[PDB]
Amino acid sequence: QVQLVESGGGLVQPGGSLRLSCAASGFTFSKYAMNWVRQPPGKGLEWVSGIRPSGDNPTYADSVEGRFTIIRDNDKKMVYLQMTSLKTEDTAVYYCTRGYGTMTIEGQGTQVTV
Amino acid sequence: QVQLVESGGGLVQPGGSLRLSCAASGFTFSKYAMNWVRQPPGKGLEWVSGIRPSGDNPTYADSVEGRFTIIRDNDKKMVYLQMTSLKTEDTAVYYCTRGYGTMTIEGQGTQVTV
Amino acid sequence: MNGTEGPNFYVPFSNKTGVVRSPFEAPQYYLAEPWQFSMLAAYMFLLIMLGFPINFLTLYVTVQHKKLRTPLNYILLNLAVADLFMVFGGFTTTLYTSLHGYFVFGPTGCNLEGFFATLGGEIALWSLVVLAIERYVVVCKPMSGENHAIMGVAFTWVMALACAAPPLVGWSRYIPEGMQCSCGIDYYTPHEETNNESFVIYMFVVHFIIPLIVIFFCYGQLVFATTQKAEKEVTRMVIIMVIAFLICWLPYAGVAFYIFTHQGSDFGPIFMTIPAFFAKTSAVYNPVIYIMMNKQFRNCMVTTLCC
Amino acid sequence: MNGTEGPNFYVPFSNKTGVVRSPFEAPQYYLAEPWQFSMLAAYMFLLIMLGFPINFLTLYVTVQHKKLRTPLNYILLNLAVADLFMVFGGFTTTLYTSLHGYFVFGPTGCNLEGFFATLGGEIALWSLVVLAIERYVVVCKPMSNFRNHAIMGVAFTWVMALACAAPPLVGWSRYIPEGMQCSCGIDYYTPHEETNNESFVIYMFVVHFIIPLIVIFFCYGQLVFTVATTQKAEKEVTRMVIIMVIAFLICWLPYAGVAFYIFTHQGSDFGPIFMTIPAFFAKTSAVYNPVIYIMMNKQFRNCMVTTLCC
Ligand SMILES: *[C@@H]1O[C@H](CO)[C@@H](O[C@@H]2O[C@H](CO)[C@@H](O[C@@H]3O[C@H](CO[C@H]4O[C@H](CO)[C@@H](O)[C@H](O)[C@@H]4O)[C@@H](O)[C@H](O[C@H]4O[C@H](CO)[C@@H](O)[C@H](O)[C@@H]4O[C@@H]4O[C@H](CO)[C@@H](O)[C@H](O)[C@H]4NC(C)=O)[C@@H]3O)[C@H](O)[C@H]2NC(C)=O)[C@H](O)[C@H]1NC(C)=O
Ligand SMILES: *[C@@H]1O[C@H](CO)[C@@H](O[C@@H]2O[C@H](CO)[C@@H](O[C@@H]3O[C@H](CO[C@H]4O[C@H](CO)[C@@H](O)[C@H](O)[C@@H]4O)[C@@H](O)[C@H](O[C@H]4O[C@H](CO)[C@@H](O)[C@H](O)[C@@H]4O)[C@@H]3O)[C@H](O)[C@H]2NC(C)=O)[C@H](O)[C@H]1NC(C)=O
Ligand SMILES: *[C@@H]1O[C@H](CO)[C@@H](O[C@@H]2O[C@H](CO)[C@@H](O[C@@H]3O[C@H](CO)[C@@H](O)[C@H](O)[C@@H]3O)[C@H](O)[C@H]2NC(C)=O)[C@H](O)[C@H]1NC(C)=O
Ligand SMILES: *[C@@H]1O[C@H](CO)[C@@H](O[C@@H]2O[C@H](CO)[C@@H](O)[C@H](O)[C@H]2NC(C)=O)[C@H](O)[C@H]1NC(C)=O
C-alpha cells in the first residue's frame, strides 16, 4: 500500500531558499525512479525535475535549470529538492511522482508560497 | 439564381392573426416542395409546416397543429402561412425553405412579434 | 415530411421526432438497428475479403501467361482491374462507414463509394455489350483478334466514365442511399440547379436501355467443330455473365427508378440499401464464372498457383 | 527523462518538449512521421488480407477431407485456427489503431492486440515443441507401438499458451503499447512491481521461451547421427518441421531480443522504431506457417486443389 509523504516547504523570501522532502513508503524504492512536479496557481502542472533509480543522472527543466537541484536517499526512502534563488513564479504546490511521469500519487504536496 | 422573398408579417395581437408570404424566384417551383421554419429568440429553429410540390398533402408540427395552415400558388410562385389564434411563443423570424429540410437560403425573413 | 432533405444528403426518415441528422456528421442508428450496420460491415468485409484474391489471381494469371490473349480474356482482365478498383476504391470506404454508421470521411468520402460503384457496374455493363457484339462477329460471320479487342476494352472505360465522372464534375451527384452507408446517383431530390433529374434520364437511356438493347439485339441474331464446342461453352458463359448481371443490377435499377418516379414518397432506409449492397457482388461473381465455366483458364490458374 | 511513463502506458520519447501524450487519448504522430503510421496500416492490411484466405482454406481443406488426420495436420489446423484468432482478434485492432495513430479503442483495445499476438507466438512455439517430440518418437523409435494422442498434444499447446497470454489480462504483468504505440505486448519497460511484471518476464523467458527451445534442440540433437517411401514422406515432413522452426526463429528472435534489451536496459535511450519494427515483423507468424504447409507438404497441396477445384 503506497504512501508518499510531502514534507518540507512553506513561506519563503523572494530569492530565498528551501529544501523539500518526499518520504516514500510501500514499494521497492530503489527499483524505480522519482520526479518532482509542481502546480502553479493558474496554469497546469510543470514537470520540475527527475532522477534515475540509481540516482546517477538527474534531469531538470529549463525553467529551474541550475537553480533547483534533486537528490534521493535509497536507504531512508526519501527524495529532496533543494530550491535556491527562488522567484515569484515558483509559487506552486509541489508533488513527487513515481516512474518518469506527471501522474501524482496521493495529493496535498507542499504549498511553497514565495 | 435563386431568390426567395419573405413578405407578410409584423406586430400582431396576442391571439390575433397574420398571413405570411414567400415569393419564389429562380427555379422550377412546382418541381420542388417548400416548407416554413421559424427562429425563436432563444432556442433553435422550429420546423413549422411543409407541403408537397403538387400541394396535395400539407404537414404541420404539433406545436402549430390546426392553428397554422399552409398553401402555395404554383402559377404565381408563392407560399403562404395563414397563422390564426397566435401565442407569445409564436414570436420568431419565419423562413420558407426548399425541399423537405430546415436548411434556409439567405432571406429577409419576417419578424412576427406577438 | 416523409423524408429529410439536406444540402449534401437526403435521409429517408421523417424529422417530425427531431432525431434526424446529417450522415456527414453523426451516426444514423435511428434509421435501422445498430446491429444491422454491423451486418453490413460483415457482408461488406467478405466482398473485400474474396474480392482481392480472386481478382488479383485473375489479373496475374492472365498477364503472366503469354497465351490467353483472346477478346474474352482482355475483357475479363479489364473486369479484374475494375473489380480491384471497386474493392480498394469503394468497398473500403463503405466497410469503414458501416462501422461508424455514417460517412465520417465526408462528402468526398461519399463520392469515392458511389464512383467505383458506378464504374464497376458500367464497366461490367459495357463489357457485356462488347461480349455480345464479339460473338455475333464470329458465329454469324457477318464480316469476314488482339488489337481489335484492346480497342473494344478501351470502349468500356470511355463509356463508363461518361456515366461515373459527371457526378464528380457537378452534373448530378453521389448521395448516401438507404442506411446512409453506400452512395449513388441522386434519384431523391430534384436538385434542378444540379440538374440530376436530366442525368437520370441520360443514365437510364444511354447507360442502361441502349446497352441492354445491343445485348438482346445480338442475342436475337442467334435464335435461329471442337473449336466451336470451345466457342459454345465460352459463348454460353457470355449468357451466364449477363444472366448474373441482370439478377445483380435489376433490383437496384428498379428501386432507383421507383424512387425517381415516386420522389418524396414513403420509403424506409432498408428499401434501397438491400439491393444496393446486393449489387456490390459484381466485384466477386464475375471472375468466379471465368474460373468456373472456362476450362482453358482454370488449368492455367493452377499452373500459376502450383508453380 | 528519456521515456515517458504513465498509468496505462509508456511512451519511448522524452517529455521535455511537453508534446508527449497518452496513446489512449491522442494520436502519437510526434513519435514518428504520420506516413509511417499509414505504412503500418498498409503492411498490417496485407497480413489480414492474406491471413484469412490462406488460413481458412487450410482450416477448411483439413476438416473437409476425412483423410489428413496425421499429428502434423492436427497441429497445422490448430495453427490455422490460432492464425485466424490473430487476424480477427488482433490484426483488426492494430490495423484500425494504425489509421488513427493511437489505441482509440482504449486499454481493453490494447489487451486484444497483445493477447492474440502472445497466443499466436506461444501456440506456434508450443506447437514446435510438439512437432519436435513427435518425430523423435517415430524416427528414433524410443517407444514401440505408440503413434487421439495427437489431439491431446494439440490441447497441450493451448494449455501452455494461455499460461503465457492470460495472466496479463488477469492483472499479473500487463499488455502495454509498444514502439509507435500501435501494437501491444508484455511490459518490459516499467518495473510495475505492484503488477509484478518484472517476475513475469523471468517466468516468460524461462518457461515460455528457454524451456521450449531446449526441448526443440534436445530433440533435434537426437537426430544428428540419424539424419520406406513413407519414410521419404516422413523425411520431407520432418524437414518441414525444421523449416517451420527456422522460420519461427527468424520471426520471433528479433522481437524477443529487443524485449530482453529493454528489460535489461530499462529507462535507457531508445526510440519508437526500436521495438515496433521487430514487433510488426513478428506478426507474419499468422501467414508464413500455412504457406510452408502448402509449399513443402505435397500431400496437402493436392487436397487443397481438390477442395478449390471441386
Ligand atoms: C507531458 O508534459 C506536459 C507538460 O505540460 C503534460 O501536460 C500537462 O498535463 C497535466 C496533467 O498532469 C495538465 O494539468 C492539469 O491542467 C488543468 C488545466 O489545463 C487546461 O487549462 C489550462 C489553464 O488553466 C491551460 O493552460 C491548458 O492548456 C488546459 O487547457 C488543471 O485544471 C489541472 O489542475 C487541477 O486539477 C488537478 C487534478 O484534480 C488538481 O490536483 C489541481 O489542484 C487543479 O485543481 C485546482 O483546484 C482548485 C481548488 O478546487 C481550483 O480552484 C482551481 O481552479 C484548480 N486549478 C486550475 C488550474 O483550474 C491540472 O494541473 C496540464 O494542463 C498539461 N499541460 C498543458 C500544456 O496543458 C503532459 O501530461 C505530459 N504527458 C504525459 C502523458 O506524460
Ligand atoms: C431535424 O430536426 C431538428 C429539430 O430540432 C433539427 O435540429 C435543429 O437544427 C437547427 C438547424 O439550424 C438548429 O438551429 C440552430 O440552433 C443554434 C443553437 O442550438 C444549440 O443551442 C440551443 C440553446 O441556445 C440548444 O437548445 C440546442 O440544443 C443546441 O445545443 C442556434 O444558435 C442557431 O441560430 C443561428 O443560426 C440560425 C440559422 O438559421 C440563424 O437564424 C440565427 O440567427 C443564428 O445565427 C440555429 O437556430 C437547432 O439548434 C437544432 N435543434 C437541436 C436538436 O438542438 C435538425 O437539424 C433536423 N435535421 C436535419 C438533418 O434537417
Ligand atoms: C538515457 O539513456 C542513456 C543510455 O541510452 C543513459 O546514458 C547512460 O548514463 C549512465 C549514467 O551517466 C552511464 O553510466 C556510466 O557510464 C560511464 C561511462 O561508460 C561509467 O564510467 C560509469 O561507471 C557509469 O556506468 C551510461 O554509460 C550511459 N549510457 C550511454 C552509453 O550513453 C542516460 O542516463 C539516460 N537518461 C536519463 C537521465 O534517463
Ligand atoms: C408519404 O408518402 C405516402 C405514399 O407512400 C403518401 O401517401 C399518399 O397520399 C396521397 C395524398 O397526398 C394519397 O392519394 C395516396 O393514396 C397515399 N398513398 C398511400 C397508398 O399511402 C403521403 O402523403 C406522403 N407524405 C407526405 C405528407 O408527403
Numbering used by the authors:
A (entry chain C), B (entry chain D): 1 to 114
C (entry chain B): 1 to 144, 149 to 228, 241 to 323
D (entry chain A): 1 to 147, 151 to 230, 241 to 323
Quote the original article:
Rhodopsin (Rho), composed of seven transmembrane domains, a characteristic of all G protein-coupled receptors (GPCRs), and its covalently bound chromophore 11-cis-retinylidene, is a major component of the intracellular disk membranes of rod photoreceptor cells. Upon photoisomerization of its chromophore from 11- cis- to all-trans-retinylidene, the photoactivated rhodopsin (Rho*) undergoes a complex sequence of structural changes, leading to the signaling state of the receptor, metarhodopsin II (Meta II). Crystal structures of Nb2 in complex with native rhodopsin reveal a mechanism of allosteric modulation involving extracellular loop 2 and native glycans. Nb2 binding suppresses Schiff base deprotonation and hydrolysis and prevents intracellular outward movement of helices five and six – a universal activation event for GPCRs.
We tested this hypothesis by comparing crystal structures of ground-state bRho, bRho*, and opsin in complex with Nb2 to a published structure of bovine opsin. Second, to obtain opsin/Nb2 crystals, bRho/Nb2 complexes were bleached in the presence of hydroxylamine (NH2OH) to induce hydrolysis of the Schiff base, followed by crystallization. a–c Superposition of the crystal structures of bRho/Nb2 (red), bRho*/Nb2 (orange), and apo-opsin/Nb2 (sky blue) complexes at 3.7-Å, 4.25-Å, and 3.7-Å resolution, respectively. Superposition of bRho/Nb2 (red), bRho*/Nb2 (orange), and opsin/Nb2 (cyan) revealed overall similar arrangements. We did not detect any major movements of the binding interface between Nb2 and the extracellular loops of bRho* or opsin compared to that of bRho/Nb2, as the retinal plug formed by EL2 remained in place over the orthosteric binding pocket. The E(D)RY ionic lock appears to remain intact in the bRho/Nb2, bRho*/Nb2, and opsin/Nb2 structures, as no rotation of Glu134 on TM3 or Glu247 on TM6 was observed. This observation differs from the published opsin crystal structures, where Glu247 on TM6 is displaced and closely juxtaposed to Lys231 on TM5, forming a new electrostatic interaction and stabilizing TM5-TM6 in an active conformation. In a similar manner, Nb2 forms crystals with opsin, stabilizing a Meta I-like conformation.
